[PDB]
Write an enzyme that holds these catalytic residues in place. Structure first.
Site, PDB file in Angstrom:
ATOM      1  N   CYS A 103     -54.903 -15.122 -31.299  1.00  0.00           N
ATOM      2  CA  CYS A 103     -53.688 -15.945 -31.210  1.00  0.00           C
ATOM      3  C   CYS A 103     -53.260 -16.167 -29.771  1.00  0.00           C
ATOM      4  O   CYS A 103     -52.649 -17.173 -29.437  1.00  0.00           O
ATOM      5  CB  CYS A 103     -52.586 -15.254 -31.983  1.00  0.00           C
ATOM      6  SG  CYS A 103     -51.361 -16.329 -32.723  1.00  0.00           S
TER       7      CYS A 103
ATOM      8  N   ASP B  93     -27.516 -39.990 -33.180  1.00  0.00           N
ATOM      9  CA  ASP B  93     -28.188 -40.408 -31.961  1.00  0.00           C
ATOM     10  C   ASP B  93     -28.260 -39.255 -30.961  1.00  0.00           C
ATOM     11  O   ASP B  93     -27.304 -38.507 -30.814  1.00  0.00           O
ATOM     12  CB  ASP B  93     -27.455 -41.590 -31.316  1.00  0.00           C
ATOM     13  CG  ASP B  93     -27.487 -42.834 -32.184  1.00  0.00           C
ATOM     14  OD1 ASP B  93     -28.561 -43.447 -32.298  1.00  0.00           O
ATOM     15  OD2 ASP B  93     -26.436 -43.200 -32.738  1.00  0.00           O
TER      16      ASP B  93
HETATM   17  C1  64Z Z   1     -42.343 -17.533 -35.220  1.00  0.00           C
HETATM   18  C2  64Z Z   1     -42.027 -16.087 -34.846  1.00  0.00           C
HETATM   19  C3  64Z Z   1     -40.585 -15.673 -34.490  1.00  0.00           C
HETATM   20  C4  64Z Z   1     -43.123 -15.043 -34.834  1.00  0.00           C
HETATM   21  C5  64Z Z   1     -44.573 -15.443 -35.102  1.00  0.00           C
HETATM   22  C6  64Z Z   1     -45.339 -15.294 -33.787  1.00  0.00           C
HETATM   23  C7  64Z Z   1     -46.846 -15.303 -33.995  1.00  0.00           C
HETATM   24  C8  64Z Z   1     -47.668 -14.173 -33.376  1.00  0.00           C
HETATM   25  C9  64Z Z   1     -47.478 -16.467 -34.782  1.00  0.00           C
HETATM   26  C10 64Z Z   1     -48.995 -16.652 -35.021  1.00  0.00           C
HETATM   27  O1  64Z Z   1     -49.301 -18.072 -35.321  1.00  0.00           O
HETATM   28  C1  64Z Z   2     -23.302 -45.072 -27.605  1.00  0.00           C
HETATM   29  C2  64Z Z   2     -23.961 -44.020 -28.495  1.00  0.00           C
HETATM   30  C3  64Z Z   2     -23.342 -42.588 -28.591  1.00  0.00           C
HETATM   31  C4  64Z Z   2     -25.230 -44.412 -29.274  1.00  0.00           C
HETATM   32  C5  64Z Z   2     -25.874 -45.811 -29.081  1.00  0.00           C
HETATM   33  C6  64Z Z   2     -27.094 -45.984 -29.992  1.00  0.00           C
HETATM   34  C7  64Z Z   2     -28.161 -46.905 -29.453  1.00  0.00           C
HETATM   35  C8  64Z Z   2     -29.608 -46.482 -29.669  1.00  0.00           C
HETATM   36  C9  64Z Z   2     -27.745 -48.292 -28.904  1.00  0.00           C
HETATM   37  C10 64Z Z   2     -28.690 -49.371 -28.315  1.00  0.00           C
HETATM   38  O1  64Z Z   2     -28.033 -50.411 -27.425  1.00  0.00           O
END
Ligand code: 64Z
Ligand code: 64Z
Ligand code: 64Z
Ligand code: 64Z
Ligand code: 64Z
Lengths: 362, 364, 362, 363, 362
Positions: free
Chosen positions: B170, B38
């Protein structure tokens, strides 16, 4: 090749004739361009990761960008195969220079809301010179309107002042600052046939009155019009930067003072293999003040063709910074000053400010 | 060998998943990391919460890629195991929804480029988003995002049509082949769903990236291209080439088949008596995984795309053991991930059925 | 009495018959009520110092308040001399539950500006149950309008959905979450003679289809209506919470699954003196995931009258947390999970959810 | 004789009024309060709180720090006529600082309202009203007389309007200490103006003796809550000590009745009769639990009741471990043992009795 | 020359006659002016890097600026070659003094939005004295309108008060504060031939009633008009500052009290080589309170021509602060108090407040 040196001085000085940068200069261009997001010249956007990672103070960013740009202009002249890349990087440089992160000190300090306003020549001198160098390198007219406007503004401030030149910020006149602004006029004139540079003679006459100690070959730190004061210390970094740029406009000026400058500030040591530069008079300490005397003197040596002093300074500056080349890219483990990789890059490639003015077109 | 230390399943097992109609236990454990706990699991909520990414220390600029590469892996999970297809479809729904949050795209605005991320020339974001829209619909049959998909597909196509070069930038004045490959692949996916022919532009793009942006001897693309200046950055890039060839193989298999062997000669170092491999990011260096540090990881994906079991096994022997995987409470954690996008890319490569197989995905 | 235990299991189970809480439960009420400013039930204002000091994450605060309230409702049943105090604390609980610090995730996540809006049953299930318990304990009609409104809203969402129940947040259905919401309808019906609880049978039939593994006596983690997906892992904490509340509405349901639940998840160890609970299948690790399997199983053991398991779980949970009583107030030096003092408090006093429904008036 | 770690004898503290002089250590505490530019607490009427930031005073406690300082200053005025002008100056600053949003702003941050004078914020406005009165008794100045009259009228109206006797300290939380301050402020107003706002006192004293006190143990329960009728089922020493001390100024017989029982219930004498410490509640051996102020408020109470033996015992427990030093004629504690530490020790050292403050001669 | 001393007392006292500052004073002027961005007198803008680097609390910045300015005014008198520089620095001083960072406490404290208001003489006394000194040093009429306005305002507050003088802030009267304000009137009178200083006699008569102990030669800490209170402690720092400034207006006043002041507060030690000052009566501790007794007494000794005491105090103050001169610039590794480099600078150059009033024009 001493330890911590990457190429010979002979190799750096030969680049233009060989039409090729050295492998370590290529590796610096890689640091500048290679890695996504974090390289300084990755993007035209207002992102400054590279400068955050280096811990560049905000007031220094404008100078980092400018000095990179001046090196890039020489890269364009050196190797035609790299000229388009250099032009691209200059485009980004100009674009980043216009971001508020770069100029915003002007506003934070209460001086104004527009950085192009009167008397911010610290910023607008460099910007104007960069506009011009971008156009010389690329032929692009992308910034030509802005360039023409800024040039006119700078010229008008010079015309309006009782002293020759402009203040770098209110009531603070610095000769380095002026040298940039005047050099930007020479670049505009080259592009457009104008004669904005006519003001240069009056400026060079003026800075030779109270602003220099002619025996010592050294400029005083600053001048302040409102009071008439000239700060009573001479400055090596100030002088080295100013003489280097002045040599592109009036070579005889810098040739006159250069040898005296060296007598005054340069300490050769380690049996002639090294040199380091005192920042002012009346001290034995090297690289006091802003810590840039040696680095700007390296640029100056390059501008004056002084291979011996260049080699000596670089033997002092580079090895302790512990360069390494990893994945064909240059990093310094221990940079010794602000603007460190910028100024070493510049000095390694610098073709001379006169040669930049006479750059053949594309 | 077969199972070295720090390996969780054999290469033979990963490649057999589709035929066995089941993911491996470690892939199940990765889906648990993705879905189980969660609040902090990445695919817990459609809301604009990014706790999983905060806990991994993902930089904000990388989140868009993290989401995309998870989505591509989920698309293959759907093809592998029909019992997990609804889950994959659910996770893709969340993926798309998270992708639209300002935390993911907001760099566009912070950088001063604009206020709407669908605007011209942000194909880093909108290429991936468009491909995800298409994969979501292929996996689920849901038309929830069909209007947006059609709009974004039309926009992308119009930018291609309007440019003197083949493709799109890009981000402004930066053209990257990987980026384009995503955008073009999204057009193929749209055409599969709707009978259109947006993919017609592909041939011109493939001709362009070959004439100019590749070193054909070395089988490697240059890093980037910049239209305003004409500049091609003079370094070749392994991560760039691996990603691009993998996606291109889904559109024009022969293209990638031509270059793949040369790519390997250029960048891949086999070591440890043939048991391992690592990839150099550029030429003129012996350093592996320089630059963004993703050469090996993207090559792992490429190997899977090309059916190269030997290289896959070698790469994963280099990548996985030093990251120190453990399975705690049936969920996968890496104590020492070696790069950005680490669990994302290993997940993807482990399940990847081939980009062509995703295009031809049978309906539900 | 092992080290780190404060009272016997026999003592906890005897509280209702002795019409008195144990000294350690008194000491927990003191933590809750005693110290100015920092005690959690000091003020109706929107101050959360007690939760800041415990480092409660913001998403958990709504559950902390709810589980405190459920324990307080049992305190009221146990000891008529403490019923007014419990009622006062429930008033504060309801008041704090309405503060933006508690519900504001709904807005931060971009779902909406009003937490009572459709499909936020994580918040509004607990709030509706609390409104009801407050009124059962005190007889006050202070919140009766809000209670009636929220009950109607919840009922309308159930009526409108093709599946039986409501989503806890958009497209995420959790059986625990539903169990709270449905239990709030039983409480409203008890106070007003209505039949909102009619929907319960359909819900219990539904959760027994794809949502449970009937052999293992365990619910799957969640269900997602838009896709039809059921997450393929079983969850101990989910099951323990759900069976406990369900036992108040349909005791036979929980009696059917409880023994299988224990076979599936509960590990008895230390020569039968202790127990801990695995969170899912296919692991030997205890208290994975959110880390609440053992704690919710403690509540469940209490709900089912399983004194042996209660004693075992509490021997595992309490001693490592290092309880001390200083100035008649209970502190845990090393709480082992989130919601730690809340759930131990609740389990120590829990009179059964059915008994809360049948609470005699004031 | 001087016990170890102590600055002056109990005999010396009690003799101050008769000698018409504070002790040197009290002078040194007044120096801490007044001497150093910017960082002394009573340096400026402005909304600056450096002294409190340096001590790490939580914001909710500042209002009490200021009030308890002011109550001590009022006794400094009675003790030494040469210091009365100074005390009056400090009280002026106290009042002025009390009105800053940093002091009262919890009222707004908690969502109760935007005006701290509103309704039902008697934790703040009780003290403020008492301070307004003490300032005027000490100086003769009518600077705050309008505000004083307004706040007094407001407090009186809330009492008149409530079915229970008294006012809540904040919504639905009734505390006897809190009320004691409010009622005492009415006595002070009546002394200055000849009015009979104090008439409500009897009904309040009758009420607090019903469910609010355990009469055998001589101890008040922690709080009362009107909406539910609840009385929190723990007794509190700090609550009782503070309440009995102030009540002794309005109805001495009330506090005389309960004081010996209070001591039996809470006070632990130890170290062969040389020391004492106070348990905060029943059913524990721990001293100074809860807010950690039982011993300190009992020290004030002992002074209020003329109990020199207990005062000496408590101060032998409280002061030496806090490691007092006098540097440049100014008092600092290296290790204060609780919140409101220098404030309450100061107050107890000088306290002339709440009744004596009511009957303070004019200047 | 003991260790940690930079020049002899004979050398400091001889500066005016030699028409030259000592090398260490030059090095202090370098710290003040040399390095780009981070030196305190680099820029007229609202930047406070030098103060951020020294960790100056915001409330102290106004005094830092003022005491620097007073030292600069003596530098001007000492060396005509440095007078323009001193004037420049004073221009910056005034300009920085007007930034909200410096005066903004007035607003943060809730007193008002304009620092020139009524009764903020802590700020406006110093600002007015600085306006005057700037004009004396430079001849510039840049601030003359503001100076005239502020002088009038100050005079009007004096005229309107039943006591002689003005409060430093509401209801707090400090003799030091007044001494600055009154001295600013003498400076205005010298520049303009007016007689604003007429009020001085009444003020000096008044401060000699309840405000001083005439046997001990020492002022009480403060006076408070609303209550009539005089804080019952005497203060060495207070007295030293006040007597120094008073000696410029009525020399006989300070000559009367100075020897008694020394008996009361000054401890000579280390066989006559050193001295330190007690801050109040009834203690053996030196430099209590704000910690400035010794430093202000150093100024006073200079003002009174007491070379022996000056030498003794400086032998106590300077060496433990570990001065070093690097690149002809002065830094203290371990300053012993607030306002440390400021007050030592001032005391080293101080020509006498009377001498400042009689400064020859430019
Ligand atoms: C994801 C990382 C660290 C480099 C890619 C950055 C880029 C120029 C994507 C073109 O779609
Ligand atoms: C208490 C914690 C850590 C999670 C509860 C999960 C949830 C979606 C309950 C809905 O009443
Ligand atoms: C680069 C650094 C640290 C200082 C530059 C000084 C200055 C004002 C230049 C104007 O162009
Ligand atoms: C001073 C501290 C720590 C507690 C007193 C709190 C309270 C309810 C006062 C009523 O005037
Ligand atoms: C400089 C420091 C620490 C205190 C100054 C006190 C004061 C109010 C002066 C008025 O000019």
């Amino acid at each position: 090749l001493p330890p911590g040196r990457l190429a010979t001085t002979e190799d750096y000085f030969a680049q233009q004739a060989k039409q090729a940068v050295t492998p370590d200069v290529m590796a610096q261009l890689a640091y500048m361009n290679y890695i996504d997001f974090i390289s300084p010249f990755y993007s035209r956007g207002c992102s400054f990761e590279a400068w955050e990672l280096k811990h560049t103070p905000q007031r220094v960013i404008k100078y980092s960008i400018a000095f990179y740009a001046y090196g890039l202009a020489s890269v364009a002249l050196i190797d035609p195969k790299l000229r388009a890349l250099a032009g691209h990087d200059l485009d980004i440089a100009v674009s980043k220079m216009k971001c508020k992160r770069v100029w915003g000190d002007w506003e934070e300090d209460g001086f104004g809301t527009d950085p192009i306003e009167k008397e911010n020549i610290m910023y607008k001198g460099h910007l104007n010179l960069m506009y011009g160098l971008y156009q010389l390198v690329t032929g692009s007219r992308r910034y030509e309107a802005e360039h023409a406007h800024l040039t006119r503004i700078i010229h008008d401030e010079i015309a309006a002042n009782p002293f020759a030149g402009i203040v770098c910020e209110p009531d603070n006149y610095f000769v380095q600052c002026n040298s940039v602004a005047y050099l930007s006029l020479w670049v505009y004139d080259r592009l457009h046939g104008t004669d904005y540079r006519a003001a240069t003679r009056a400026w060079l006459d003026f800075i030779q009155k109270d602003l220099i100690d002619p025996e010592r070959g050294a400029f005083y730190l600053s001048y302040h019009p409102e009071s008439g004061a000239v700060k009573p210390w001479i400055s090596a970094y100030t002088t080295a930067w100013t003489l280097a740029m002045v040599h592109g406009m009036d070579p005889a000026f810098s040739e006159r003072y250069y040898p005296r400058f060296k007598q005054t500030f340069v300490e050769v040591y380690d049996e002639g293999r090294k040199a380091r530069v005192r920042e002012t008079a009346g001290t034995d300490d090297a690289d006091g003040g802003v810590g840039l005397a040696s680095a700007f003197t390296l640029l100056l040596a390059r501008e004056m063709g002084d291979q011996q002093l260049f080699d000596q300074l670089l033997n002092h500056l580079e090895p302790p910074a512990k360069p390494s080349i990893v994945s064909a890219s240059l990093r310094y483990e221990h940079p010794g000053s602000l603007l460190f990789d910028e100024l070493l890059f510049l000095a390694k490639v610098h073709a001379g400010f006169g040669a930049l003015l006479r750059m053949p077109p594309p």
